[PDB]
DNA sequence: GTTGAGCGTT
C-alpha cells in the first residue's frame, strides 16, 4: 500500500529486470528505475509498489542480491 | 566504454 525505494541497484539493471525479480515475492503493481533522461543511464536506485501488504513487509525484512549486488528496500523520505 | 550514497521529471 506504499512505495518502497530500492537502493544499491547495479548500473545495468533495467525496469523489467527489477520487476522480474520482485515478482518472485508477489504481484508487483509498478516499478521504477531512475535514470538521466538524456542518456538513459541508471542513477542506481528505483521504486516498487506491491499489491499485497504482506509481500511488502517480507521484501523489507531482507536484503536483495540483484544482478550481483546487495540492494536495500526502505520506506522513502517524502 | 567511467561512479556506489542516496530519496521519485512526466
Round and report the angstrom distance from CA (A45) to C1' (B6): 8
Say what the resolution is, in angstroms.
2.6
Which CATH code is given to the segment(s) A1-78?
3.30.70.330
Which nucleotide has the shortest C1'-to-CA distance from A76?
B7
Could you tell me where the beta strands, DSSP code E, fall in chain A? 4-7, 28-35, 42-50, 64-66, 69-74
Most distant pair of Cα atoms in chain A: their distance = 37
Q: Which chain B nucleotides are covered by protein, judged by CB under 7 A?
A: 2-10
By residue count, chain A amounts to 78
- For residues A66 and A62, give the distance between their C-alpha atoms in angstroms, rounded to a whole number: 12
Per-residue b or e along A7-32, where b marks 16 or more CB atoms closer than 10 Å to that residue's CB: eebeeebbeebbbebbeebeebeebb
Which nucleotide has the shortest C1'-to-CA distance from A45?
B6
CB within 8 Å of A70: residues ≥ 6 apart:
A8, A63, A64
- For residues A77 and A72, give the distance between their C-alpha atoms in angstroms, rounded to a whole number: 14
Amino acid at each position: 500500500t506504499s512505495d518502497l525505494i530500492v537502493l544499491g541497484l547495479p548500473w545495468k539493471t533495467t525496469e523489467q529486470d527489477l520487476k522480474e525479480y520482485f515478482s518472485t515475492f508477489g504481484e508487483v503493481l509498478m516499478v521504477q528505475v531512475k535514470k538521466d533522461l538524456k542518456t538513459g543511464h541508471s542513477k542506481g536506485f528505483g521504486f516498487v509498489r506491491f499489491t499485497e501488504y504482506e509481500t511488502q513487509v517480507k521484501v523489507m525484512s531482507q536484503r536483495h542480491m540483484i544482478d550481483g549486488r546487495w540492494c536495500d528496500c526502505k520506506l522513502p523520505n517524502s
